[PDB]
Amino acid sequence: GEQWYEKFKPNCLEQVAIHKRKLKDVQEALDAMFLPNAKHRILLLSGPSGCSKSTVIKELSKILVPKYRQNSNGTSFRSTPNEHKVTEFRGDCIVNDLPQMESFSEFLKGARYLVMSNLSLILIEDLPNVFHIDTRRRFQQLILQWLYSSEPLLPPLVICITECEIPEND
Amino acid sequence: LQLPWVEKYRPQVLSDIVGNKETIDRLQQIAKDGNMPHMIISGMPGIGKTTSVHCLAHELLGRSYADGVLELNASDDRGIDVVRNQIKHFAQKKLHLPPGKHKIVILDEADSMTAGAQQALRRTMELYSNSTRFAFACNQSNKIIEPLQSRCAILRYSKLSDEDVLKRLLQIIKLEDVKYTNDGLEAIIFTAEGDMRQAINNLQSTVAGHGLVNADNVFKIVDSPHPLIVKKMLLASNLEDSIQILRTDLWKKGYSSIDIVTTSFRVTKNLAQVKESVRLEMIKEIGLTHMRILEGVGTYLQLASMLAKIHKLNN
Amino acid sequence: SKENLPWVEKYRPETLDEVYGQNEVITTVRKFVDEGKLPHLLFYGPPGTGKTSTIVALAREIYGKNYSNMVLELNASDDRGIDVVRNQIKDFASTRQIFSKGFKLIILDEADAMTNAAQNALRRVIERYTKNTRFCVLANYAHKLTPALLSRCTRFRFQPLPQEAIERRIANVLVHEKLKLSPNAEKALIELSNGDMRRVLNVLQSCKATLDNPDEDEISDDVIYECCGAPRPSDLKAVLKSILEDDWGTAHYTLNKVRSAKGLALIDLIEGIVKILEDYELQNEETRVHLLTKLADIEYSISKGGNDQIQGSAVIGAIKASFEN
Amino acid sequence: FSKIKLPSNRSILEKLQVFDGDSTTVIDGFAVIGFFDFTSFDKIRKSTKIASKVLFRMDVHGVLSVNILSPGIVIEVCMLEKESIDEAAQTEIELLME
Amino acid sequence: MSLWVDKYRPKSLNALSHNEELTNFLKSLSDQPRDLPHLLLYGPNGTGKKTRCMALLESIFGPGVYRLKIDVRQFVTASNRKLELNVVSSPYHLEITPSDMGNNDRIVIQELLKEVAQMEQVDFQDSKDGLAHRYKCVIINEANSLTKDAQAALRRTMEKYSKNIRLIMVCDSMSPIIAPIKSRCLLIRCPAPSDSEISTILSDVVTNERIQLETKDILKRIAQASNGNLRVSLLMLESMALNNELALKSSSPIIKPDWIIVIHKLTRKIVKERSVNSLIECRAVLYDLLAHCIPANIILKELTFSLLDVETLNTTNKSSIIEYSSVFDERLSLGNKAIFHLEGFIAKVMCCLD
Amino acid sequence: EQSLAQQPWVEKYRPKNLDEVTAQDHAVTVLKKTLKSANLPHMLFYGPPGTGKTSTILALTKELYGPDLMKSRILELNASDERGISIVREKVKNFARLTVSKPSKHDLENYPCPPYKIIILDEADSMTADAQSALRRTMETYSGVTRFCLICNYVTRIIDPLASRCSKFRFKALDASNAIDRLRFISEQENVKCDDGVLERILDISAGDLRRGITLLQSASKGAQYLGDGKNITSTQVEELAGVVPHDILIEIVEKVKSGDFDEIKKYVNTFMKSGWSAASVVNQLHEYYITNDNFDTNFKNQISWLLFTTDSRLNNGTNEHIQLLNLLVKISQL
DNA sequence: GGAAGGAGCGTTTTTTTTTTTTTTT
Ligand SMILES: Nc1ncnc2c1ncn2[C@@H]1O[C@H](COP(=O)(O)OP(=O)(O)OP(O)(O)=S)[C@@H](O)[C@H]1O
Ligand SMILES: Nc1ncnc2c1ncn2[C@@H]1O[C@H](COP(=O)(O)OP(=O)(O)OP(O)(O)=S)[C@@H](O)[C@H]1O
Ligand SMILES: Nc1ncnc2c1ncn2[C@@H]1O[C@H](COP(=O)(O)OP(=O)(O)OP(O)(O)=S)[C@@H](O)[C@H]1O
Ligand SMILES: Nc1ncnc2c1ncn2[C@@H]1O[C@H](COP(=O)(O)OP(=O)(O)OP(O)(O)=S)[C@@H](O)[C@H]1O
Ligand SMILES: Nc1ncnc2c1ncn2[C@@H]1O[C@H](COP(=O)(O)OP(=O)(O)O)[C@@H](O)[C@H]1O
Ligand SMILES: [Mg+2]
Ligand SMILES: [Mg+2]
Numbered sequence A: 001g002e003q004w005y006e007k008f009k010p011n012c013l014e015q016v017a018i019h020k021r022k023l024k025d026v027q028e029a030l031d032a033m034f035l036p037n038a039k040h041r042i043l044l045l046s047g048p049s050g051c052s053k054s055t056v057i058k059e060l061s062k063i064l065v066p067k068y069r070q071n072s073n074g075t076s077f078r079s080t081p082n083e084h085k086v087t088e089f090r091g092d093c094i095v096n097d098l099p100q101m102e103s104f105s106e107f108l109k110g111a112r113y114l115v116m117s118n119l120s121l122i123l124i125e126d127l128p129n130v131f132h133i134d135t136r137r138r139f140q141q142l143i144l145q146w147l148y149s150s151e152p153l154l155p156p157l158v159i160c161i162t163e164c165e166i167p168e169n170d
Numbered sequence B: 001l002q003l004p005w006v007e008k009y010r011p012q013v014l015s016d017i018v019g020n021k022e023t024i025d026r027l028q029q030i031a032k033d034g035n036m037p038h039m040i041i042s043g044m045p046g047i048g049k050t051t052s053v054h055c056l057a058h059e060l061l062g063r064s065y066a067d068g069v070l071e072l073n074a075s076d077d078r079g080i081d082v083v084r085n086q087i088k089h090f091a092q093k094k095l096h097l098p099p100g101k102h103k104i105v106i107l108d109e110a111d112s113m114t115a116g117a118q119q120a121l122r123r124t125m126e127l128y129s130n131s132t133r134f135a136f137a138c139n140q141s142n143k144i145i146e147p148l149q150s151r152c153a154i155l156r157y158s159k160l161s162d163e164d165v166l167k168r169l170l171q172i173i174k175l176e177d178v179k180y181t182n183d184g185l186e187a188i189i190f191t192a193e194g195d196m197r198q199a200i201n202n203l204q205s206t207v208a209g210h211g212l213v214n215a216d217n218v219f220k221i222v223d224s225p226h227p228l229i230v231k232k233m234l235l236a237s238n239l240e241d242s243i244q245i246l247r248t249d250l251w252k253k254g255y256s257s258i259d260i261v262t263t264s265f266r267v268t269k270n271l272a273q274v275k276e277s278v279r280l281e282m283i284k285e286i287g288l289t290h291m292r293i294l295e296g297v298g299t300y301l302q303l304a305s306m307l308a309k310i311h312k313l314n315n
Numbered sequence C: 001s002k003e004n005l006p007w008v009e010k011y012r013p014e015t016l017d018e019v020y021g022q023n024e025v026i027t028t029v030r031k032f033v034d035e036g037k038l039p040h041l042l043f044y045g046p047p048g049t050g051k052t053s054t055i056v057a058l059a060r061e062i063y064g065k066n067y068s069n070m071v072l073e074l075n076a077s078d079d080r081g082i083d084v085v086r087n088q089i090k091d092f093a094s095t096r097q098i099f100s101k102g103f104k105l106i107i108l109d110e111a112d113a114m115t116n117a118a119q120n121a122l123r124r125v126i127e128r129y130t131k132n133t134r135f136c137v138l139a140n141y142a143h144k145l146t147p148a149l150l151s152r153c154t155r156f157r158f159q160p161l162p163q164e165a166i167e168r169r170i171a172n173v174l175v176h177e178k179l180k181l182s183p184n185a186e187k188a189l190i191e192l193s194n195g196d197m198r199r200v201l202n203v204l205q206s207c208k209a210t211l212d213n214p215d216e217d218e219i220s221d222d223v224i225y226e227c228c229g230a231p232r233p234s235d236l237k238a239v240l241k242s243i244l245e246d247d248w249g250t251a252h253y254t255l256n257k258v259r260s261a262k263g264l265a266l267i268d269l270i271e272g273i274v275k276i277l278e279d280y281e282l283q284n285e286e287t288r289v290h291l292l293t294k295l296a297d298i299e300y301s302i303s304k305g306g307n308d309q310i311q312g313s314a315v316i317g318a319i320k321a322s323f324e325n
Numbered sequence D: 001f002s003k004i005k006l007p008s009n010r011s012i013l014e015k016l017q018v019f020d021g022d023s024t025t026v027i028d029g030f031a032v033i034g035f036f037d038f039t040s041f042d043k044i045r046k047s048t049k050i051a052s053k054v055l056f057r058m059d060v061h062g063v064l065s066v067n068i069l070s071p072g073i074v075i076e077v078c079m080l081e082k083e084s085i086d087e088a089a090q091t092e093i094e095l096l097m098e
Numbered sequence E: 001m002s003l004w005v006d007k008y009r010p011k012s013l014n015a016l017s018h019n020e021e022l023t024n025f026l027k028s029l030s031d032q033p034r035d036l037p038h039l040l041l042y043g044p045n046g047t048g049k050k051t052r053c054m055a056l057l058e059s060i061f062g063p064g065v066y067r068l069k070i071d072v073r074q075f076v077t078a079s080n081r082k083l084e085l086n087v088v089s090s091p092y093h094l095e096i097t098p099s100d101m102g103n104n105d106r107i108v109i110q111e112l113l114k115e116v117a118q119m120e121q122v123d124f125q126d127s128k129d130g131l132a133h134r135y136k137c138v139i140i141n142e143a144n145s146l147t148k149d150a151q152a153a154l155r156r157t158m159e160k161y162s163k164n165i166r167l168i169m170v171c172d173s174m175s176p177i178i179a180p181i182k183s184r185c186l187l188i189r190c191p192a193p194s195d196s197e198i199s200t201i202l203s204d205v206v207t208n209e210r211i212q213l214e215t216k217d218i219l220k221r222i223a224q225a226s227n228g229n230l231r232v233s234l235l236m237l238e239s240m241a242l243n244n245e246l247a248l249k250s251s252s253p254i255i256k257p258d259w260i261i262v263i264h265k266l267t268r269k270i271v272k273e274r275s276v277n278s279l280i281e282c283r284a285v286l287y288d289l290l291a292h293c294i295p296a297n298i299i300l301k302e303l304t305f306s307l308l309d310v311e312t313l314n315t316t317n318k319s320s321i322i323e324y325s326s327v328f329d330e331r332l333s334l335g336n337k338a339i340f341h342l343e344g345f346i347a348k349v350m351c352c353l354d
Numbered sequence F: 001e002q003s004l005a006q007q008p009w010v011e012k013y014r015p016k017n018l019d020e021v022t023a024q025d026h027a028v029t030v031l032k033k034t035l036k037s038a039n040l041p042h043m044l045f046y047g048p049p050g051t052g053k054t055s056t057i058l059a060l061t062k063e064l065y066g067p068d069l070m071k072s073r074i075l076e077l078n079a080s081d082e083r084g085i086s087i088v089r090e091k092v093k094n095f096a097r098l099t100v101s102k103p104s105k106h107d108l109e110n111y112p113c114p115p116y117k118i119i120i121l122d123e124a125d126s127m128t129a130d131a132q133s134a135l136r137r138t139m140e141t142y143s144g145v146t147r148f149c150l151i152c153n154y155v156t157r158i159i160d161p162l163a164s165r166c167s168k169f170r171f172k173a174l175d176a177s178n179a180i181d182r183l184r185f186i187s188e189q190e191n192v193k194c195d196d197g198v199l200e201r202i203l204d205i206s207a208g209d210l211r212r213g214i215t216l217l218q219s220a221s222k223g224a225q226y227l228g229d230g231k232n233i234t235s236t237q238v239e240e241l242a243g244v245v246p247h248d249i250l251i252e253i254v255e256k257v258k259s260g261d262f263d264e265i266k267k268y269v270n271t272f273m274k275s276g277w278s279a280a281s282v283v284n285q286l287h288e289y290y291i292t293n294d295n296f297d298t299n300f301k302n303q304i305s306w307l308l309f310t311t312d313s314r315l316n317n318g319t320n321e322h323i324q325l326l327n328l329l330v331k332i333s334q335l
Numbered sequence G: 001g002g003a004a005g006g007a008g009c010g011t012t013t014t015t016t017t018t019t020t021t022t023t024t025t
């Protein structure tokens, strides 16, 4: 009982349902971001539901990450090449020794290390519970700190926000 | 004790559900096939949405209904923590089911779910759609956020016709051995206004009250829907007729002025015959009267003045 | 202890036989309890028609004199948010009876004051536990109730009290007390009741207080008007006649004198004149339109205070202009 | 579903009796199951903290009485049982106990 | 130094120089101030109501009433919104302007004033034995700007604690004052000074400042331009004297508030051209005026009376203008956003003129 | 002597017992007989400003309980207090459920001491509708030990269920016919010398408000004492103190309106508003002048009555006095 | 060489009470 939208998902960038000019703009922006001293640190993608934001990001990563990832000096976690081109944040993850609002803070503190031979594209689609005021403030502070960070090396950070209206709730 | 007829005669199978014949046939097809996708069921109260979803789940999962169905509604805790823990653990559960069958998460009254929980459900649906499927039930389909709607097949239920209501009422009467007359069933259907829960409740009340379901016996307890009375009042060509209707049929029967004005606004919103200018002027007058009533002047004189202004607008 | 209570509470019906003016509803509920097939109930009606009294009497009949142990009553004076519905109401509805005394009863008095979220939470609580529990909702304003809750409940309308029921209750009160009431006084009391028994009882208590010697003095219509400070029908008729026949100065003087004789309020005179004119045979329909609009405007202005003399002159001028058409 | 079983020894379970719902006839092989919401069952934890002995007594009407003995402080807690037990819960309980 | 408005401020009842009947009434009030009722002074803005209130307080207590300090009182709303109010205090009286807190003014009445009313003022007697008690005087500036809730909250505070407190409210119009509050106060009308008295005061200031005046007609023209507002008269006198090297002449221009000239230009534009684009330009002017925190009702009144002065307009146009002004003034009073009503008034005027 | 003379006359002469309340006998009789019947119902006093509602309830409580017992049997809340839904559901409910306090032997021997408490909600019309609804079942459930007294000026602001629950008492307006005796007694107590008819003029000006009349009398007495000439107070002085426009100014306004020239009316109104006259008083005087004039026809009187009503409503809404007055005068001129 | 089709534009954001969820404890 496989669903069609997953069964017939694109297997290459050529099959992504994206306007050509928008695809070119996104690809150029990401490729520039992958530079050693790229001017842009965060790529923010916004739009309506189901417009191929995450899909195009993943398809572009599948090509960009191998191109720019440095070859390991005979070192890796497991025998396989560790195909982890995209590192995604999980908002429902709960660990024993961590307050909820700090979870995102932890994620970034790890994501910082995924550079050079450990290069990976950081994707933020499942955001933290930004409806909580304190959580939203912490999220904004973390984003600002990433933007203003003095670290010489950082991985490209892509934030995909699906814009929708919140129906009135009792 | 004996259960009320509304709950006693709740259908157990899809075949016993009347109305929305195409929709019920599609549900039966899904039940006999197995590959159930994420679905949303929208419609007005008391037309079989909860019954349809529960019957579909029961038929799909057979003996495995207990361990394969997770039901949550507005009376249970359904916050973001619930999505994070209970729904997540249920979706992660490895359950052996017949080929083409999946675990079902029923979210009744899903419209009332909080924004944070709805946003959290996105990742759950994305990750655990292979083994889990979601059946949302609501009255307003637009109250479910668009990202969730994007994954679900929409299914809108229409108001039940008089024929299906009569058919199921006859089935219930045959089961209960109830003496009746045709006019009584017509009156019950007219008062039900397409809501079958109300139809069954009124039938039970009438059967208890007198035993024989006649039009006069039906109208002794059940009253004609007041929206139709309000429409007749508004459409009266003479101010005297409108005032007489307002007095005899609404005010003397105990209907509150606030209810009368709210119903008047709702009815005027759907007056097809009237022109747009007249309709908007009537809406303005109704709103002014409503503002006066909210301040505390909920008197019959204010409603009479509103009717007079509406009649002036007509002329 | 009952003697010290106000008459509105002292004469609260204790059994369903004491509830008057609701014969159809009362018979239906009585026979439902006789057959033990009570459904979820909604009692919709205006103030002081016997909804709370009827439901309490039904609970007493069902559970005898120990109804307080298996009846959960909640009203607007208690918090009834979604948390309350989730915890307290749900736990009560999902627990067994004290002594297996059939089903439990939950009364939500003044449910039109509950929030939308709580009402939405109530739907599945009502549906799931129907076997063990039955819900009763009471309301004066149906527009505050969600469509689902209305659909789940069997509706009963409490009409404004008919005259005969009020007369029977008044006779019962008069035999209880050592009080005498005149037929004209009773007619005036019914007319001013507007189908509310609370008003009847309060006005009767005030009238008894007014009597110098209640052991022998009889209550007349004059006593009722004094206690309520309301205009007499003759005063309204005279004011209307002067407005519709005499000149502006004469009408102004007549209104001022009629008001100063007993300190009558202008709003009461307006209401009485409106009631009188509602029966007038008008050959021109624009007159009714102008009367209704202008008098409603004057009533709304009076509700916010303002100048009394200007408002009275406005009433006079509005009536004259309307009838000049 | 988890289980906590008290030992069948005269130091934690002094005595246990099932009377078939009349307090007189002792019946063997019959199991009495009482379903409660933890929000109410847990309210006796503070009393048990100081308790020296506890006596459970359940009747047929779904009422459970806990007598706590700590000259002394004596506590009585009376609670009502839930309306009914779901099929899944009954199956899980039977599997746990067998 | 200090502005001439404050430099020559009278500091006593005997120092007053216009509206002698009001001065005599105030003096009569101060003869036996023990049973002084609550006072409500109403009159046109800038006529000297605060000055007369201070003179009465000085007569009752002494010059020390003029030694004023400022404190900040912190309030917290239900939503935890923290905000502050300025309390002007002297050893004998307090001064507050609750309207500065907008819709939260009622809080000021419920918490601060009530407390002031509840705390009885007692002091050790210097000579006699036992304590001595004196009621506190409180001034409420801009009383007519209070919300109805604050006015309602004032009632029982004024009544129950009359021993410990006496209120002196000041307003420009009594129309927004609820009837219960007016019932609880002694109402004092404060007429504006006549042109002759304004000219006399201005001439006294000129003599004090050694400013050369060509003729006294300049003072009369300034008084006419001020429309009875003595504060404005003094401010324009100072501005004209400074801009003319302290030598006034008949040719010296009369300086008026900038927003007034802006409204005059708006009126001229409205009369000249009447179209949708003209209406949009008028809306831009109105928004610019509102950006300076000019009250909407004041803008409407000034625009209406500027329009009524145009000579080309006829009787029918003026009648329609005043009708629309009244209707839209009521709408502003009952409304939430003033832009709708001002734009509607301008549109109606454009329709009537064209 | 100074201590007694340290209060405004309105508070100084507030009625102490129910006997001192004037012109409200229709309700005072019932309240008085309640002292013997001990059958006090829930009360809803409603009426225009300064008619004796708060005074009546305070006197009733004092007579029922006394100086000592009152402190434990009375709970008073007014507009100056917080009265949200939470307050109604917690504090009012707790007090209504409180057990009746034990009277002392002195209290029992000196006062009736009925076996219930009293909750007074002054200015009840300021409470929200939801908060009012929160009182409905509290009033009924605890009527055996608690009685409620709501007081208001606008009865329509009280929700219908609460009005139904409460026995209603309408306080009448106090005018020169029913309140003259109290004002004359107050004047005699203070040795206020006035010309014949001055008290009636004060009562007529006050328009149903005895508090305003007492304040006006006190102001006139203060003026006379300061003058110290020994002459009796005059109606002209009372009118001047009350803010009544002089007859000559009203006549000038009437002639200007009769002329019908918009510009002259505008100039005269601009000059007139400098004096600071309250628009309400001018409108009332114009209504009195025109409505009682015999030189105008029926149509004119109808139109002017409607115009005056509209202007008065607009002013009550809190509008600019100058604009409304000019509009009214222009409209009358076009009649 | 005309359509037809499509992209980018046209933006910012507390406040009264009352109720509710969320998070950390
Ligand atoms: N040709 C296609 N192009 C793009 N997406 C496709 C295509 N075929 C199938 N899909 C699927 O359609 C879905 C929509 O694409 P997404 O990129 O996930 O949507 P979106 O723009 O990210 O908005 P949200 O936030 O996911 S609701 C994905 O699950 C894709 O795998
Ligand atoms: N189509 C139908 N056929 C037969 N009985 C029906 C039908 N619709 C409603 N009923 C009866 O009404 C009862 C309630 O049906 P539900 O499906 O729970 O109502 P609903 O459509 O879910 O309305 P909401 O959204 O829950 S308020 C059932 O138990 C039946 O007795
Ligand atoms: N049908 C009736 N028969 C006899 N007395 C009645 C009747 N209805 C009301 N009363 C009297 O009025 C009192 C109030 O009745 P309730 O039933 O509490 O009013 P209600 O119908 O609940 O109105 P609401 O909705 O609470 S404002 C009772 O205690 C009786 O004294
Ligand atoms: N009926 C009366 N008899 C005697 N004095 C009265 C009467 N009414 C008012 N007064 C006087 O006016 C003062 C105020 O009386 P209140 O009882 O507070 O009037 P009120 O009805 O409460 O006015 P509101 O509604 O609060 S504006 C009293 O202290 C008396 O001096
Ligand atoms: N009798 C007077 N002699 C001289 N100046 C006066 C007199 N009365 C008022 N003023 C001046 O008018 C100015 C404003 O008066 P103010 O009391 O602020 O008006 P408002 O009544 O608007 O409060 C003061 O600065 C004061 O100098
Ligand atoms: Mg995606
Ligand atoms: Mg449903």
Ligand SMILES: [Mg+2]
Pocket (backbone or CB within 6 Å): C051, C052, C053, C109, C138
């Ligand atoms: Mg009730």
Ligand SMILES: [Mg+2]
Pocket (backbone or CB within 6 Å): F053, F054, F055, F122
């Ligand atoms: Mg009062």
